[PDB]
Amino acid sequence: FGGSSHAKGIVLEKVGVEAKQPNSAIRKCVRVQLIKNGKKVTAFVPNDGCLNFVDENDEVLLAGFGRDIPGVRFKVVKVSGVGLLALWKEKKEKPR
Amino acid sequence: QWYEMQKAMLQKQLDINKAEYAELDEHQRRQVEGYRAGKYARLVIEGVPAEFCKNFQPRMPILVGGLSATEDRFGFVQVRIKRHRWHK
Amino acid sequence: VTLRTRKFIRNPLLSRKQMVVDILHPGRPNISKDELREKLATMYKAQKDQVSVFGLRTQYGGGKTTGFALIYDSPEALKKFEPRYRLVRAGL
Amino acid sequence: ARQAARSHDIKEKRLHVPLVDRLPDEPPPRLVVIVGPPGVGKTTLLKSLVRRYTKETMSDPVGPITVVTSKKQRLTFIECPNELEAMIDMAKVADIVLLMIDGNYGFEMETMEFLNILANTGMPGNVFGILTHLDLFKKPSALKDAKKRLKHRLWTELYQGAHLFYLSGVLNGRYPDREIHNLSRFLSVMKNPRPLVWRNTHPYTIIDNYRDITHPTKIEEDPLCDRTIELSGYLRGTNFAAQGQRVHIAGVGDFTISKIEELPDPCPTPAMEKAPRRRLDEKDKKLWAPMAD
Amino acid sequence: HQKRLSAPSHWLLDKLSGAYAPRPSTGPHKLRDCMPLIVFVRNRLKYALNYRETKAIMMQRLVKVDGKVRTDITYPAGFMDVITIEKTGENFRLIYDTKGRFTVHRITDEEAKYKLGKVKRVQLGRGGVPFLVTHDARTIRYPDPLIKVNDTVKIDLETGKITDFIKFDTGALAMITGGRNMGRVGVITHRERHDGGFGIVHLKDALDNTFATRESNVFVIGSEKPWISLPK
Amino acid sequence: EAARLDSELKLVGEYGLRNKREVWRVLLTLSKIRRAARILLTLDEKDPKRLFEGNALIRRLVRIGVLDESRMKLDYVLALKAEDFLERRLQTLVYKLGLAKSIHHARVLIRQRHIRVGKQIVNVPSFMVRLDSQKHIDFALTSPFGGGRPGRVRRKKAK
Amino acid sequence: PNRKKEQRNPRVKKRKKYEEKQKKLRSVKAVYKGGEGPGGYQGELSGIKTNLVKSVKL
RNA sequence: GCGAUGGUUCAUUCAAAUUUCUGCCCUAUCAACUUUCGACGGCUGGGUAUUGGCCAGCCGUGGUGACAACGGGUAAGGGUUAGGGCUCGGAGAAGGAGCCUGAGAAACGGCUACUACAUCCAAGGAAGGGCAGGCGCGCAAAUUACCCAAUCCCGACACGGGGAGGUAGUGACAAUAAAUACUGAUACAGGGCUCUUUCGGGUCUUGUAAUUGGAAUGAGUACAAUUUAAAUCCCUUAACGAGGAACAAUUGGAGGGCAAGUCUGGUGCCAGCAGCCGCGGUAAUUCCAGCUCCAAUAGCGUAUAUU
């Protein structure tokens, strides 16, 4: 995207919130809308229990995903100014 | 510049009101748009229990909030809860 | 408490005796330069009040301590020829 | 190329969610809480701040204290008492927070409780750590060690690189004037409050003046009866309803509005009086403490 | 208020006196041909430590320069000024060395009593009187009538009168006080006129090095006759 | 690579080092010395640059005790190594002089200020001890192995 | 996560890693480890196997 | 008699002003240029501190240029020589216009008028024109620190005054050194490890949440003295300061084990995804009791661009 390394976005809708199996990639993927350009791209939350911190209409930083749905390119790094792995590790509370 | 376009649409709505109820005092400014924010105001509350007036201390302040139409109904709230990190 | 004076200079126009002092406390803590002013009265046959000590950096590893000592001919010569901060540190 | 990369990173840093402002043209006074554990000197900072601003030595300042600090904006200081009901009542209310830490003693559970109550309820714009009781120290190496460790723990708590002021002594029973002058340099120039969803949808009010308007024949008949209460304050959220507004008086319960009188300000703040000079002449430094002395 | 490196290379300062250096006050000798009294007392001789100590020496009548009491601290004393300190009972004299720097010379009253000064110009002053201007800006009224330009004079320094003079001569040993061959005590053996500006002399040392220096930069010191004691 | 990992692990084990940063530090200064020796071998024999600069380098290494006093050629200066540098460290010198039982005991002693090199106590275990100063490694006077007070656990037990 | 007392100190971990990798080396090759003891030759103390050729065939 | 203050002239110093020859980078899609504020002289005066077309009257015919004038482009070094280093280097004080002081200014320090902002007032009047700091989204990151104590400067003058200078504070952006343990004895178990070739081969001392014993402390706490303008740091330094349940090492990656639990598939008992969730129980539980391995280790990972 763009010319930058990380993009910001709005979480439009957590697609695959009603998927059955817990660590499905359709369960982990989230449709976000990038601020700078306006397009809706899909991004992976790194973990299914870590999906619960991503709420609707939250400013979300996302980066590339460099390594079950092959081709979803982005991963959610920060949510509302706090790092998502820190939220998952219970280091910080999310400012809303 | 989708962010500034969205913020400009919000400011356009925030100009459309205060442009639309700037037309009459007794009808719009009093009855349509209520009692606008920032203005000092005196409230008369009827039916307060007398234990409040007997145990009124000036330290612990008074916060008046406005309930919505939905905030007076009762029912089963389904919530997403988690214990705190430092609660034993 | 062992004392040696190197580089003793007369300076009569400033009227004050200039000594590079190498003092040694082995095994003791530091030297307490007011007590060193008391010590530099009988070593050079003077009053304690007309001596001012400054410099006084302790060498590495204890023992040696290099100070600079000035003995004036009179306390009033000290008063008219000493800096304000050294006069305050001495106590006059 | 690297200039373009840094420009793109900052252009992505500037972005947020497009929320609604809901701030009027003549805005209400921004609410400054003075929160801390018991015995830390919140009332002392209140006395010192109101003497800095309006030059009035209050011997016992209670309630909200409204203060003109600029020609456009004004403040109001409320000291939270040491009860959790008041802390949870005012954490959803506060516009800027003055969060007090007790120096040599370190952090306290009331400070951490208010920090995470505020973060869970709604994070305001400006929270300033104020570290006091620094004069109860003997070694000024232990002093800077305590300042460093308290700064780093507060930075872990709220965000990295916050403002932590150090208020050293208590000279005239009040505070040092230079320390509270730079504290007021930081809390005087101001930016618009953060668009919180709860404050931008629901209309609230923090009562400046209380009065019991009840007939003494009713009080003589029934000593414990339903009374009528005049509560005077600034309307702060969205606008109240013109008739029949349902009210939650926090700590008492739900009632309905019997009357609203909309009347002019006691702190006029000269933009509203003139409706491009910098300084504030002493005509303008008003004090409206209708419960304090 | 010049820096320590912008101070000239012939009154020395070490890495010690701060980044700044005192400027000489206006007076008899020049700016770039100068030793101030503070550099002479506390930076060369080290009879003092600080500026305030140098002031406490100078303000009381303890330092006399060319036989008169000089009070101000940055008084210029460039060349051959006898500096009498009475509490130490010494008289210093300023000469140069072979490398091109200032040199101090301790001496007593017998050689301290006179000054060897080079004549700058002879003229007829007001009153129809001939007068004589040296390099110390000393003007002597009614001189000896052969003392022309570039001749040196033994000034009395207790009355200031003329006592003797040394003529500009091819065969009289001289001292260089300027130029790229600065400070080289040797004998004037040749002199070339170059009328139209900037004439020269050719001069050799005691041990056969010929070089050409300008007649402004020369300074006569004596034929053999070392009338001031150059340090042995 | 496994060769680099096994080599650095052999160094860190054989001389009681803390991490691989100390190994890379020694390898960097060894590569600097060896690069200077190769640049001096580039020139022909009996060039004055090679003569005086190689004599300076060889006298420096013999004086700091790395290079042996027997072999003094620039080819042996090229044949130098990191085992020789870590042998010239102080901590292995305490272990080899036998003031300590193991190399980790030696690092512990040098950290908590028991040995001294010459006159002053030495707080750092990577102190490059020279050949002239190798003999004067002993327990300090303020240490309970040297004298003075019987020490800490001794005081708590003898009370 | 919960980590080890060995992992909280980077020297002690590299001491125990070297002691166990010097131990794994004795199970592959043969270390010298002193010649005959003070007691003399008590036999080849752990077996002699006859049909085993352990020479690098050039 | 010795000085201080003052005075004419000549010096001298500190300056300032002009002034002589040489040296700018490129270009002819720049060959004519100057006389278009006189262009080159010489005479006479004016003004200047003085010379001078610098300016005014009179006349003469010039001056530069293909050896590169003129125009255009804007991208505005010298000295000290092993080296690097070190040293030196136009216009405005809201806008034009005019004036005042002094040795030195066309100070911008003041005045006057006009123009343009803007403040107090009792509505008659009256004073005034800089930088630094924060925000510059609603989301952020180096002190509003202390002193002239050294070096230096200005004055009736040893004392009075200095926004150069020095002192301190922050800092995982880097960079430097290296803590978080060292060492024994005894008891008990018989397996530990490896691989090409694997229901096979290779090698011989390894363990344990076992029981005990020794010492060694620097982080921190800290009396002092010292350092310093006053403090801090440093160096000295008396006294405390280690048994894990702590003085509490991290960041990543790979893998095993688990239920009277849950979900899904289907020619019974199988398989898969997985599993903080189980009958009870939260002052209840003591459990894989702290699971195993690999990498870096006070550092480490991810994304994108990539090379």
How distant, in Å, are the alpha carbons of C66, D139, D186 from that of C32?
A: 13, 21, 47
In sequence order, the 6+-apart residues with CB closer than 8 A to the CB of D250 are B62, B63, B64, B65, D89
Distance from C-alpha of B42 to C-alpha of E180, rounded to nearest angstrom = 96
- State the Cα angle at E29 between E65 and E232, rounded to 5°: 65
Q: Is D125 annotated as a binding residue?
A: no
Helix axes G10-26, F103-111, angle to 10 degrees: 170
Helix axes F48-63, F21-42, angle to 10 degrees: 150
List, in order, residues 6 or more apart from G23 with CB less than 8 Å away: none
Q: Is C39 helix (H, G, I), strand (E, B) or coil?
A: helix
Hey, are the CB atoms on B10 and D18 less than 8 Å from each other? yes
Query: How much of chain E is helix, strand and coil, in % rounded to 5?
Result: 10, 35, 55
Q: What is the 3-state secondary structure (H, E, C) of D109-178?
A: HHHHHHHHHHHHHCCCCEEEEEECCCCCCCCHHHHHHHHHHHHHHHHHHCCCCCCEEECCCCCCCCCCHH
Length of chain G: 58
Residue in D closest to A62 by C-alpha: D12
- Resolution in angstroms for this experimental structure? 7.1
Side-chain-side CA neighbours of F77 within 13 Å: the count stands at: 23
What type of residue is D246?
R
Q: Which residues make beta-bridge pairs with A60?
A: A9, A79
User: What would the two tokens of residue A31 be?
Assistant: 């449709």
**Chains with 3 or more CB pairs closer than 8 angstroms to A?**
B, D
- Inter-residue contact D260 to D240 (CB < 8 Å): yes
Residues 127-146 of F with CB under 7 A from strand H: 142-145
Which of D125, D135, D145 lies closest to D191, judged by CA? D125
Helical pair F90-97 and F103-111, crossing angle rounded to 10 deg: 120
CA distance F58 to chain G (A): 34
Query: What is the rounded CA–CA span in Å between residue G18 and residue C56?
Result: 51
Breaks (C-N over 2.5 A) in chain C follow: none
Q: Where are the beta strands (DSSP E) in C10-86?
A: 16-25, 51-58, 63-72
* Distance between CA atoms of residues F60 and F65, nearest Å: 8
Question: Could you tell me if E150 and E215 are in contact, meaning their C-beta atoms sit under 8 angstroms apart?
Answer: yes
Name the residue among E228, E231, E198 with its Cα closest to residue E213: E198
Spatial contact of G14 and F13, defined as CB atoms under 8 Å apart: yes
| Cα E155 to Cα B86: distance, rounded to the nearest angstrom | 97
- C-alpha F124/C-alpha E166 separation (Å) is 73
Q: Stated in angstroms, how far is F101 CA from H215 C1'?
A: 12
Residues 62-81 of C with CB under 7 A from strand H: 62, 67
E88 — contact with chain C (CB < 8 Å)? yes
User: For D197, phi and psi rounded to 5 degrees?
Assistant: -70, -40
What are the tokens at F17? 């080092």
- What is the C-alpha separation between D75 and D90, in angstroms, rounded? 16
The neighbour count for residue F105, using CB atoms within 10 Å, is: 15
Q: Cβ of E38 < 7 Å from strand H?
A: yes
Maximum Cα interatomic distance, chain E, rounded to a whole number of Å = 54
Strands D30-35 and D74-79: parallel
Shortest Cα distance, chain E CAs vs residue C22, angstroms: 20
**Contact E152/E220 with Cβ under 8 angstroms?**
yes
- Beta strand residue intervals within chain E, DSSP E: 63-65, 68-69, 83-85, 90-96, 102-107, 115-125, 129-134, 139-141, 152-155, 162-166, 173-176, 186-192, 200-204, 210-214, 218-222
Total Cβ atoms within 10 A of residue D89? 19
What is the DSSP track for B12-53? HHHHHTTTSS-S-IIIIIIIIS-B-TTSEEEEEEEEE-HHHH
Q: Can you spell out the DSSP letters for F95-121?
A: HHHTSSSSHHHHHHHHHTT-EEETTEE
For every residue of D47-91, which 3-state class applies, written as one string?
Answer: HHHHHHHHCCCCCCCCCCEEEECCCCCEEEEEECCCCHHHHHHHC
E229-CA/H15-C1' distance, Å? 37
End-to-end CA distance of chain G: 53
- Per-residue b/e over E219-229, b at no fewer than 16 CB within 10 Å? bbbbeeeeebe
Interface contacts (A, D; CB < 8 Å): 40
The answer to whether the beta carbon of residue E68 comes closer than 7 angstroms to any atom of strand H is: no
- Distance (Å, whole) CA E111 – CA D270: 87
Tell me how many helices (H) and strands (E) chain E has: 3, 15
Which among D94, D86, D85 is positioned nearest to D33, based on CA atoms? Answer: D94
- Single-letter residue type at C16: R
- For residues D123 and A54, what is the distance between their CA atoms, to the nearest angstrom? 17
Question: Hey, which residues does A6 pair with through a beta bridge?
Answer: none
Neighbours of D283 (CB within 10 A): 8
**Option in B34, B39, B60 nearest D81 (CB):** B60
CA gap D269, B40 in Å, rounded: 13
Report the alpha-carbon distance of residue F22 to residue F11 in Å, rounded: 10
In F11-104, the DSSP E strands lie at none
Asked if B80's CB is within 8 angstroms of A52's CB, the reply is: yes
